């Protein structure tokens, strides 16, 4: 039917055989625990890294936790990545995406600063965008860097694009030199062939998407929810990656196409035969390691071209 | 106004001051000579390269001249680039694009084979696509290689895409690994904002485009003229570059967007503040050297990822 990598199909079959409630049948605290446990079982470890540090920074509606990863702390000032995790604006935290952030720091050879932004339903829309924009501006002001590289997965891919638009309109202390949205959401609408094709049996389901969206309570007319409905001109060079079996695939394609139509230099990658969520499934789906390394190698080159110009 | 690099504006002012007939006021033989002279004055030299060889190959209508460039002739079999020069399907030859082809061979560290395909009006459409396809199949059958990288500028960027579509539908003896259309034409129509904005004073003009089109006499309904009107699914990884002051810019953007909407892995670059034809203007417009190097560095990486998988 649809091209599926053998290791991905193996993982889906393992998923399907598990007993216990679906995420959508759980309170937020249970869902949060489910994702932590899934990462413990199906993601790789942090691995060796020179420096990881946690602190709190000021934010407009309270303090924001952030985590710095750096495998070469005696570096000269250069690019810094600011990372927003996924989790449907409800789940995920600094631990769920810790393996990926450490790997990104190692491959990219830049510091990675992960943001622990406020989550729904305790803090509904627009808390996540507000925190992500404030933390990103804080990094520009307070960290030695020459420019910012924004990135994140899923909900965090949404936040990447939203925050890049915010900084385009009102620059931070340092420019955004590149962005890397990973299987992002860019609209609330579901009128996509990929949604029809992959909205069941591929981890991110119609059920889970409804559950997340009901808790987040986004305004579908606000650019901070639905950036595809707003001009993309003047955004930084973009690396956008989708997964081929992902309900969100077609909207990601559409956003990348929109960037190109606005003259934004754009690299589009599609992880063929894998699913939404792969960046935190690198033990369960070993091929994810190649998707991660592939994309980050290309991002490192985009950033090098920017810093060499 | 429109963003123009200072060195580009300098070159346009020099162009504007030149006396003598416009290309479109000339017979084809005169236009051909004009382009050769322009390259002698405004392009860099071939430079040092280990091997350049000429031969004839058997094409459908007679001998097709080809030229092989290789800076490492003792190499093991690997990818080979097949290059189709531009010139509006009327002008250009193996000398007009010789500096670029030698530079491509040096940077890519692969052999480059340039094709001297049949030109209009002596040989109208579809002679050029026929020759380009036949020569590409010849290379796959007769040159030691593992796969093909197709590339070309302007009319040659059209021929890149058309040839890749033909080989998708009926594979050659070696797969097409990647394609690199450079400021391509992908349709016969002129309903584009970039055409209205840059159709005068930026080298490729409304007048020259009409003159080329009239000689080539393409069928606007045929995929070998207007690839944008036909499915792009299943094409190889694509690096498409445009120039920001080019009448063809918007159709190039549109074709790259179409590739992404078909799931083709696509790298889109836009040479900001420069014109159509820059790859043969690297002495007149020194910044063209950076546009050339930047694209070929990216292409080298695309090919390495393909061949490493
Ligand atoms: N050195 C600033 C910092 C510390 C910890 C986490 C993020 C940023
Ligand atoms: N984007 C976080 C996620 C992954 C898989 C399933 C649901 C949510
Ligand atoms: N961020 C995961 C997601 C996508 C679409 C709708 C709801 C949740
Ligand atoms: N339906 C949830 C959602 C919210 C914001 C952006 C995309 C999707
Ligand atoms: N130093 C490059 C340059 C030349 C002319 C005008 C502006 C800039
Ligand atoms: N001719 C170089 C230059 C351009 C602008 C301002 C100062 C110097
Ligand atoms: N020295 C004459 C000149 C300089 C730059 C571009 C065109 C012509
Ligand atoms: N006689 C060798 C050769 C091969 C390809 C192109 C030119 C020459
Ligand atoms: N292929 C357009 C063109 C015309 C004249 C000189 C250079 C380039
Ligand atoms: N109008 C000239 C032309 C011919 C073929 C393809 C594109 C443009
Ligand atoms: N290949 C140069 C060109 C483009 C469009 C129309 C005519 C010629
Ligand atoms: N960049 C000076 C120049 C202008 C025209 C032709 C050759 C060189």
XYZ file of C-alpha atoms and ligand atoms in Angstrom:
714
model
C 0.000 0.000 0.000
C 2.219 2.856 1.253
C 5.988 2.490 1.337
C 7.008 1.607 4.887
C 10.577 0.846 6.018
C 10.860 -2.678 7.507
C 12.082 -1.340 10.880
C 9.208 1.159 11.006
C 6.685 -1.591 10.288
C 8.269 -3.711 13.053
C 7.914 -0.862 15.498
C 4.284 -0.179 14.536
C 3.495 -3.871 15.058
C 5.099 -3.744 18.507
C 3.086 -0.550 19.320
C -0.162 -2.166 18.141
C 0.327 -5.200 20.422
C 0.619 -3.104 23.583
C -2.297 -3.125 26.010
C -3.401 -0.180 28.089
C -5.340 3.031 27.418
C -4.719 5.294 24.440
C -3.212 8.695 25.221
C -6.566 10.335 24.425
C -8.175 8.359 27.250
C -5.797 9.767 29.885
C -5.594 12.984 31.926
C -2.614 15.183 30.946
C -0.461 13.903 33.818
C -0.850 10.307 32.620
C -0.146 11.235 28.992
C 2.985 13.052 30.133
C 4.193 9.971 31.969
C 3.407 7.794 28.915
C 5.662 9.902 26.713
C 8.484 9.848 29.285
C 8.241 6.058 29.509
C 8.123 5.687 25.731
C 11.353 7.683 25.422
C 13.037 5.594 28.092
C 12.137 2.452 26.157
C 12.318 3.524 22.495
C 14.839 6.416 22.366
C 18.633 6.272 22.628
C 20.434 7.638 25.721
C 21.850 11.138 26.082
C 25.335 9.796 25.475
C 28.561 11.626 26.163
C 28.481 15.404 26.048
C 30.833 17.983 27.589
C 28.315 20.361 29.193
C 24.634 20.311 30.097
C 23.318 23.046 32.354
C 19.884 24.065 33.583
C 18.638 27.488 34.652
C 15.570 29.687 34.939
C 15.162 32.878 32.940
C 12.648 35.696 33.353
C 9.534 35.545 31.254
C 6.447 37.736 30.826
C 4.079 35.367 32.636
C 6.653 33.788 34.964
C 10.064 32.169 34.869
C 10.976 29.828 32.014
C 13.236 26.785 32.475
C 15.900 26.277 29.839
C 18.641 23.697 29.281
C 21.971 24.302 27.520
C 23.784 21.488 25.714
C 27.305 22.086 24.430
C 29.924 19.589 23.373
C 32.625 22.283 22.919
C 32.236 24.930 25.634
C 35.516 26.715 24.880
C 34.180 27.782 21.482
C 34.300 31.323 20.139
C 30.974 33.095 19.764
C 29.047 31.566 16.890
C 25.554 30.309 16.066
C 23.331 28.972 18.827
C 20.328 26.722 18.340
C 17.120 27.332 20.255
C 14.988 24.225 20.356
C 11.262 23.815 21.102
C 10.129 20.279 21.838
C 7.013 18.649 20.511
C 4.169 16.985 22.350
C 0.970 18.557 20.950
C 1.406 21.620 23.221
C 0.388 19.372 26.169
C 3.146 16.844 26.789
C 6.920 16.662 26.447
C 9.574 18.378 28.508
C 13.326 18.798 28.807
C 13.761 15.054 29.429
C 11.640 13.661 26.561
C 13.818 15.373 23.952
C 17.120 15.258 25.834
C 18.683 12.505 23.636
C 17.913 14.455 20.470
C 19.187 17.767 21.815
C 22.501 16.202 22.903
C 22.859 14.543 19.502
C 22.086 17.828 17.762
C 24.734 19.615 19.826
C 27.271 16.965 18.916
C 26.538 16.878 15.177
C 26.011 20.581 14.645
C 28.901 21.690 16.900
C 26.848 24.542 18.264
C 25.224 25.083 21.649
C 21.611 23.912 21.837
C 19.239 25.655 24.226
C 16.027 23.786 24.848
C 12.982 25.723 26.125
C 10.583 24.254 28.698
C 7.610 26.348 27.546
C 4.261 26.437 29.303
C 1.903 23.572 28.442
C -1.834 23.246 27.946
C -4.370 22.738 29.384
C -2.973 24.502 32.449
C -1.625 27.228 30.169
C -3.641 27.204 26.929
C -2.799 29.027 23.727
C -1.047 31.474 23.430
C 1.187 30.562 26.385
C 3.516 28.331 24.361
C 4.277 30.950 21.614
C 4.672 33.694 24.246
C 7.219 31.648 26.214
C 9.099 30.510 23.106
C 9.409 34.074 21.775
C 10.473 35.483 25.159
C 13.050 32.731 25.771
C 14.464 33.177 22.218
C 14.842 36.951 22.690
C 16.472 36.281 26.076
C 19.036 33.977 24.428
C 19.834 36.623 21.824
C 20.358 39.216 24.520
C 22.283 37.161 27.078
C 24.247 34.400 25.334
C 27.416 34.991 23.370
C 26.377 34.193 19.857
C 26.420 35.653 16.382
C 22.992 34.468 15.327
C 20.211 32.051 16.137
C 19.135 28.773 14.578
C 15.555 27.926 15.586
C 14.300 24.335 15.505
C 11.687 21.994 16.953
C 9.519 18.983 16.184
C 5.760 18.791 15.560
C 4.197 21.400 17.921
C 7.783 22.587 18.242
C 8.036 22.864 14.480
C 4.986 25.097 14.596
C 6.662 27.138 17.345
C 9.857 27.374 15.243
C 8.037 28.970 12.342
C 5.869 31.205 14.564
C 8.865 32.474 16.494
C 10.864 33.084 13.293
C 7.951 35.217 12.000
C 7.877 37.160 15.267
C 11.601 37.916 15.067
C 11.393 38.793 11.373
C 8.849 41.477 12.166
C 10.701 42.726 15.287
C 14.364 41.681 15.314
C 16.030 40.294 18.377
C 19.533 41.344 19.437
C 20.935 38.778 16.959
C 19.509 37.660 13.598
C 17.844 34.326 12.967
C 20.219 32.839 10.470
C 18.346 29.594 9.732
C 15.347 27.584 10.871
C 14.722 23.826 10.999
C 11.086 22.874 11.542
C 10.743 19.081 11.869
C 7.401 17.541 10.758
C 5.660 20.786 11.738
C 2.024 21.655 12.139
C 1.273 24.877 10.203
C -2.543 25.009 10.157
C -5.467 23.690 12.136
C -7.294 22.329 9.072
C -7.245 18.607 8.197
C -8.206 18.720 4.507
C -5.115 16.876 3.311
C -4.650 13.598 1.508
C -1.965 12.630 4.010
C -4.446 13.124 6.833
C -6.988 10.865 5.096
C -4.276 8.286 4.378
C -2.274 8.260 7.651
C -4.637 9.498 10.385
C -4.842 5.957 11.804
C -2.184 3.370 12.686
C 0.838 5.693 12.430
C 1.331 6.960 16.029
C -0.078 10.482 15.495
C -3.738 9.679 15.049
C -6.975 11.612 14.463
C -7.841 10.782 18.101
C -4.619 12.127 19.552
C -4.706 15.251 17.343
C -8.261 16.018 18.557
C -7.209 15.506 22.184
C -4.180 17.783 21.892
C -6.087 20.460 20.008
C -8.957 20.507 22.509
C -6.537 21.090 25.388
C -4.451 23.742 23.564
C -7.510 25.714 22.425
C -5.628 27.616 19.730
C -7.147 30.487 17.842
C -7.149 29.168 14.256
C -7.074 32.704 12.812
C -3.950 33.744 14.730
C -0.577 33.569 12.953
C 0.834 31.991 16.123
C -1.329 28.946 15.416
C -1.657 28.873 11.628
C 1.382 30.411 9.977
C 0.609 29.049 6.519
C -2.166 31.666 6.289
C 0.288 34.575 6.599
C 3.103 35.911 4.357
C 6.418 34.015 4.518
C 8.549 36.638 2.724
C 11.775 37.540 4.481
C 12.065 34.422 6.638
C 15.545 32.920 7.069
C 16.891 29.965 5.083
C 14.794 26.956 6.051
C 15.398 23.210 6.279
C 11.942 21.596 6.514
C 11.626 17.829 6.931
C 8.502 15.696 6.838
C 7.850 12.017 7.367
C 6.191 10.235 4.457
C 3.632 8.317 6.593
C 2.662 11.352 8.694
C -0.814 12.969 8.591
C 1.003 16.345 8.745
C 3.157 15.527 5.694
C 1.143 17.456 3.132
C 0.876 20.671 5.138
C 4.651 20.552 5.614
C 5.113 20.185 1.874
C 2.710 23.092 1.437
C 4.598 25.339 3.799
C 7.925 24.542 2.110
C 6.327 25.317 -1.271
C 5.034 28.625 0.169
C 8.518 29.571 1.364
C 9.951 28.984 -2.121
C 7.137 31.003 -3.734
C 8.141 33.868 -1.392
C 11.810 33.630 -2.382
C 13.047 32.042 0.828
C 15.950 29.618 0.304
C 14.474 26.301 1.290
C 15.751 22.719 1.610
C 12.945 20.156 1.699
C 13.639 16.646 2.979
C 11.109 13.822 3.300
C 11.959 10.845 5.508
C 10.609 8.155 3.156
C 8.847 5.215 4.806
C 8.850 6.530 8.383
C 6.395 8.140 10.780
C 5.713 11.272 12.778
C 7.790 11.400 15.962
C 10.881 9.592 14.758
C 13.400 12.002 16.302
C 12.650 10.530 19.758
C 12.342 6.916 18.570
C 15.951 6.214 17.588
C 16.262 2.958 19.532
C 12.806 1.595 18.548
C 13.339 2.663 14.913
C 17.105 2.436 14.240
C 16.780 4.081 10.817
C 15.757 7.283 12.655
C 19.425 7.762 13.491
C 20.121 8.273 9.760
C 17.156 10.643 9.372
C 18.510 12.708 12.276
C 22.127 12.712 11.099
C 21.133 13.380 7.499
C 19.102 16.445 8.326
C 21.569 17.874 10.825
C 24.475 17.479 8.398
C 22.529 19.587 5.862
C 21.597 22.134 8.548
C 25.225 22.461 9.633
C 26.106 23.301 6.007
C 23.304 25.885 5.738
C 24.585 27.563 8.868
C 28.208 27.442 7.644
C 27.223 29.144 4.401
C 25.456 31.871 6.372
C 28.389 32.432 8.702
C 30.906 32.388 5.820
C 29.053 35.051 3.759
C 13.425 49.296 -6.210
C 14.741 45.754 -6.613
C 17.745 44.534 -4.682
C 20.748 44.488 -7.007
C 24.338 43.608 -6.018
C 26.742 46.520 -6.680
C 28.895 44.385 -9.005
C 25.807 43.315 -10.944
C 24.681 46.916 -11.340
C 28.198 47.832 -12.560
C 28.026 45.084 -15.158
C 24.531 46.081 -16.359
C 25.714 49.684 -16.737
C 28.633 48.447 -18.846
C 26.192 46.280 -20.959
C 23.825 49.250 -21.440
C 26.606 51.463 -22.784
C 27.573 49.014 -25.537
C 26.854 50.013 -29.116
C 25.839 47.704 -31.927
C 22.750 45.643 -32.780
C 20.724 43.708 -30.225
C 20.961 39.918 -30.520
C 17.386 39.809 -31.812
C 18.360 42.046 -34.749
C 20.908 39.460 -35.910
C 20.841 36.231 -37.923
C 21.602 33.150 -35.785
C 25.238 32.984 -36.862
C 25.821 36.541 -35.625
C 24.033 35.871 -32.333
C 26.234 32.790 -31.883
C 29.358 34.870 -32.380
C 28.058 37.516 -29.957
C 27.740 34.947 -27.185
C 31.242 33.552 -27.834
C 32.700 37.068 -27.672
C 30.766 37.869 -24.506
C 32.243 34.787 -22.819
C 35.745 35.676 -23.935
C 35.346 39.121 -22.358
C 33.104 38.483 -19.332
C 33.801 34.883 -18.249
C 36.809 33.434 -16.453
C 39.237 31.152 -18.302
C 39.020 27.360 -18.271
C 41.863 27.213 -15.770
C 43.904 24.173 -14.856
C 42.253 20.803 -15.305
C 43.790 17.324 -15.702
C 41.797 16.060 -18.719
C 39.563 17.556 -21.393
C 38.665 15.363 -24.360
C 36.380 15.779 -27.400
C 34.656 13.071 -29.447
C 31.598 12.452 -31.562
C 28.898 10.015 -30.509
C 26.093 8.524 -32.663
C 22.899 10.440 -32.274
C 19.549 9.943 -33.974
C 20.279 12.553 -36.685
C 24.018 12.173 -36.963
C 27.089 12.820 -34.844
C 26.610 14.619 -31.512
C 29.808 16.319 -30.311
C 30.532 15.880 -26.622
C 33.303 17.091 -24.342
C 34.579 15.270 -21.236
C 36.136 17.222 -18.368
C 37.840 15.397 -15.489
C 40.241 16.686 -12.867
C 40.979 13.136 -11.535
C 41.081 10.803 -14.549
C 42.533 7.856 -12.622
C 39.355 7.733 -10.504
C 37.301 4.664 -9.786
C 33.881 4.540 -11.470
C 31.471 6.888 -9.734
C 28.823 9.459 -10.681
C 29.100 11.380 -13.929
C 27.529 14.761 -14.696
C 25.864 15.282 -18.053
C 25.563 18.993 -18.836
C 23.320 20.764 -21.341
C 24.331 24.357 -22.111
C 21.892 27.228 -22.420
C 21.449 29.698 -25.225
C 17.683 29.820 -25.900
C 17.880 26.602 -27.976
C 19.571 28.688 -30.715
C 23.034 29.703 -29.480
C 25.787 28.380 -27.219
C 28.173 25.509 -27.761
C 31.000 23.593 -26.085
C 33.138 26.768 -25.861
C 30.533 29.161 -24.394
C 30.163 27.048 -21.274
C 33.653 25.586 -21.097
C 34.838 27.651 -18.052
C 31.792 26.593 -16.040
C 32.123 22.921 -16.965
C 35.780 22.850 -15.951
C 34.962 24.537 -12.642
C 32.127 22.057 -12.056
C 34.495 19.143 -12.676
C 37.019 20.610 -10.221
C 34.548 21.316 -7.414
C 32.352 18.228 -7.794
C 35.300 15.804 -8.301
C 33.295 13.914 -10.893
C 33.633 13.828 -14.685
C 31.478 16.336 -16.567
C 30.271 15.561 -20.087
C 28.916 18.528 -22.006
C 26.540 17.873 -24.939
C 26.535 19.886 -28.191
C 22.868 19.234 -29.061
C 21.115 20.337 -32.249
C 20.126 24.017 -32.366
C 17.238 25.927 -33.864
C 16.275 27.272 -36.313
C 18.179 24.729 -38.406
C 16.831 22.007 -36.094
C 13.631 23.213 -34.381
C 11.875 21.652 -31.422
C 12.005 18.767 -30.511
C 15.546 18.217 -31.823
C 17.274 19.510 -28.664
C 15.384 17.205 -26.200
C 15.823 14.255 -28.543
C 19.600 14.767 -28.704
C 19.964 15.406 -24.982
C 18.104 12.209 -24.142
C 20.045 10.181 -26.708
C 23.409 11.481 -25.555
C 22.517 10.854 -21.894
C 21.582 7.240 -22.681
C 24.871 6.915 -24.588
C 26.833 8.063 -21.550
C 25.047 5.528 -19.320
C 25.814 2.747 -21.831
C 29.468 3.663 -22.649
C 31.137 5.605 -19.806
C 32.241 3.910 -16.624
C 29.909 5.271 -14.009
C 27.505 4.319 -11.238
C 24.854 6.951 -11.915
C 24.102 10.216 -13.683
C 23.808 13.796 -12.443
C 21.987 15.947 -15.019
C 22.482 19.719 -15.119
C 22.187 22.718 -17.389
C 21.396 26.422 -17.475
C 18.372 28.255 -18.914
C 17.325 26.260 -22.029
C 19.704 23.649 -20.610
C 17.837 23.727 -17.316
C 14.657 22.984 -19.282
C 16.549 20.122 -21.002
C 17.743 18.850 -17.597
C 14.193 18.516 -16.324
C 12.766 17.139 -19.606
C 15.549 14.559 -19.842
C 15.113 13.508 -16.219
C 11.361 12.983 -16.871
C 12.122 10.843 -19.930
C 14.583 8.677 -17.951
C 12.154 8.389 -15.034
C 9.604 6.942 -17.469
C 12.145 4.655 -19.193
C 15.382 4.243 -17.254
C 18.789 4.381 -18.824
C 21.411 1.762 -18.017
C 22.389 3.796 -14.882
C 19.993 5.742 -12.626
C 19.743 9.507 -12.447
C 21.078 10.235 -8.926
C 20.309 13.962 -8.845
C 19.500 16.888 -11.103
C 20.634 20.503 -11.065
C 18.568 22.804 -13.291
C 20.065 26.354 -13.238
C 17.623 29.242 -13.854
C 15.469 26.905 -15.985
C 12.612 27.613 -18.305
C 9.739 25.263 -17.471
C 6.848 26.752 -19.506
C 6.320 28.785 -22.665
C 3.977 31.371 -21.119
C 5.020 34.785 -19.798
C 2.321 35.390 -17.151
C 4.723 35.880 -14.247
C 5.412 38.942 -12.107
C 9.160 38.398 -12.565
C 8.741 38.625 -16.357
C 6.921 41.967 -15.999
C 9.510 43.228 -13.518
C 12.781 42.047 -15.152
C 11.946 41.621 -18.832
C 13.964 44.732 -19.659
C 17.477 45.786 -18.707
C 18.602 42.503 -17.161
C 20.311 40.691 -20.081
C 17.533 38.175 -20.847
C 14.904 40.496 -22.299
C 11.374 40.190 -23.697
C 12.895 40.814 -27.152
C 15.530 38.085 -26.859
C 13.002 35.610 -25.431
C 10.598 36.223 -28.338
C 13.456 35.789 -30.824
C 14.598 32.503 -29.274
C 11.036 31.169 -28.994
C 10.205 31.998 -32.598
C 13.267 30.102 -33.844
C 12.751 27.071 -31.577
C 9.023 26.742 -32.375
C 8.177 24.597 -29.390
C 4.782 22.994 -28.927
C 3.416 24.618 -25.728
C 1.343 21.484 -24.914
C 4.294 19.044 -25.045
C 6.018 17.965 -21.811
C 9.380 18.433 -23.547
C 8.600 22.169 -23.711
C 6.462 22.781 -20.608
C 7.358 20.286 -17.869
C 5.504 22.338 -15.238
C 2.210 21.085 -16.741
C 3.014 17.366 -16.136
C 3.445 15.221 -12.990
C 6.794 15.508 -11.227
C 6.366 12.522 -8.907
C 9.349 10.169 -8.857
C 11.995 12.598 -10.133
C 15.435 12.408 -8.476
C 16.637 14.763 -5.735
C 16.733 18.211 -7.273
C 18.845 21.327 -6.698
C 17.104 24.208 -8.477
C 18.600 27.679 -8.467
C 17.159 30.933 -9.722
C 18.459 34.445 -10.024
C 16.398 37.097 -8.227
C 16.446 39.604 -11.136
C 15.564 37.040 -13.797
C 12.314 37.052 -15.799
C 12.333 33.232 -15.383
C 12.605 33.461 -11.570
C 8.969 32.903 -10.757
C 8.512 29.846 -12.979
C 11.623 28.358 -11.355
C 10.130 28.963 -7.929
C 6.904 27.388 -9.162
C 8.643 24.295 -10.468
C 10.555 23.792 -7.204
C 7.248 24.169 -5.298
C 5.683 21.557 -7.590
C 8.517 19.121 -6.887
C 8.005 19.447 -3.142
C 4.224 18.990 -3.475
C 5.047 15.723 -5.309
C 7.389 14.562 -2.516
C 10.597 15.051 -4.457
C 13.512 16.019 -2.175
C 14.275 19.523 -3.350
C 16.922 22.153 -2.513
C 15.907 25.640 -3.696
C 18.484 28.403 -3.916
C 17.927 31.958 -5.143
C 20.953 34.045 -6.128
C 19.841 37.305 -4.553
C 20.638 40.476 -6.461
C 21.978 38.890 -9.659
C 20.746 38.122 -13.165
C 20.021 35.378 -15.622
C 23.172 33.998 -17.220
C 25.581 34.511 -14.312
C 27.283 31.105 -14.622
C 29.102 32.364 -17.748
C 29.756 35.875 -16.402
C 32.210 35.181 -13.591
C 34.800 37.785 -14.691
C 32.272 40.554 -15.473
C 30.320 39.800 -12.263
C 32.867 38.514 -9.716
C 30.148 37.545 -7.211
C 29.045 34.873 -9.706
C 32.028 32.842 -8.516
C 30.329 32.532 -5.099
C 26.972 31.615 -6.656
C 28.708 28.886 -8.663
C 30.768 27.546 -5.785
C 27.864 27.674 -3.362
C 25.555 25.634 -5.591
C 28.163 23.089 -6.575
C 29.150 22.547 -2.920
C 25.512 21.755 -2.133
C 25.218 19.479 -5.188
C 28.391 17.603 -4.186
C 26.750 16.880 -0.829
C 23.465 15.697 -2.450
C 25.433 13.266 -4.593
C 27.489 12.047 -1.617
C 24.300 11.346 0.339
C 22.840 9.434 -2.607
C 25.932 7.356 -3.191
C 26.498 6.692 0.541
C 22.976 5.273 1.096
N 25.187 29.918 30.326
C 23.776 30.312 30.196
C 22.820 29.157 30.326
C 22.946 28.267 31.377
C 22.088 27.189 31.491
C 21.105 26.997 30.560
C 20.974 27.866 29.515
C 21.808 28.963 29.399
N 4.769 15.195 18.352
C 4.699 14.409 19.584
C 3.914 13.157 19.334
C 4.536 12.083 18.722
C 3.819 10.927 18.465
C 2.489 10.844 18.809
C 1.868 11.909 19.415
C 2.575 13.071 19.669
N 1.436 18.831 17.337
C 0.737 17.562 17.090
C -0.608 17.926 16.528
C -0.803 18.236 15.192
C -2.042 18.589 14.705
C -3.115 18.650 15.567
C -2.913 18.395 16.886
C -1.682 18.028 17.384
N -5.811 21.557 16.055
C -4.595 21.826 16.836
C -3.631 22.801 16.196
C -3.310 23.974 16.837
C -2.403 24.859 16.303
C -1.842 24.623 15.104
C -2.129 23.462 14.447
C -3.009 22.552 14.983
N 32.820 47.487 -1.801
C 31.821 46.933 -2.724
C 30.939 48.039 -3.244
C 31.241 48.679 -4.437
C 30.450 49.723 -4.881
C 29.361 50.132 -4.147
C 29.026 49.466 -2.987
C 29.828 48.440 -2.521
N 33.500 52.032 -3.454
C 33.333 51.278 -2.184
C 32.407 51.976 -1.222
C 31.033 51.937 -1.398
C 30.180 52.596 -0.528
C 30.699 53.338 0.498
C 32.059 53.385 0.685
C 32.920 52.712 -0.168
N 36.237 48.666 -14.875
C 35.031 48.783 -15.699
C 33.929 47.912 -15.152
C 33.925 47.551 -13.809
C 32.910 46.746 -13.312
C 31.917 46.295 -14.139
C 31.881 46.681 -15.452
C 32.896 47.473 -15.973
N 37.531 9.222 -26.233
C 37.105 9.415 -24.834
C 36.006 10.432 -24.615
C 34.904 10.100 -23.846
C 33.888 11.011 -23.633
C 33.955 12.262 -24.188
C 35.037 12.610 -24.944
C 36.059 11.704 -25.167
N 20.700 33.002 -22.941
C 20.490 34.449 -22.845
C 21.684 35.268 -23.269
C 21.631 36.084 -24.393
C 22.733 36.840 -24.768
C 23.893 36.790 -24.025
C 23.954 35.991 -22.904
C 22.854 35.234 -22.523
N 8.696 30.447 -25.411
C 9.971 29.733 -25.584
C 10.024 28.474 -24.758
C 10.128 27.264 -25.419
C 10.191 26.073 -24.727
C 10.119 26.076 -23.362
C 10.012 27.276 -22.678
C 9.972 28.474 -23.369
N 16.057 29.859 -22.587
C 15.945 31.311 -22.633
C 14.493 31.609 -22.883
C 13.531 31.540 -21.887
C 12.189 31.802 -22.155
C 11.804 32.081 -23.444
C 12.752 32.083 -24.445
C 14.084 31.809 -24.183
N 34.390 43.166 -13.598
C 35.008 43.979 -14.667
C 34.611 43.506 -16.040
C 33.517 44.036 -16.706
C 33.148 43.565 -17.957
C 33.855 42.549 -18.537
C 34.939 42.012 -17.880
C 35.326 42.485 -16.641
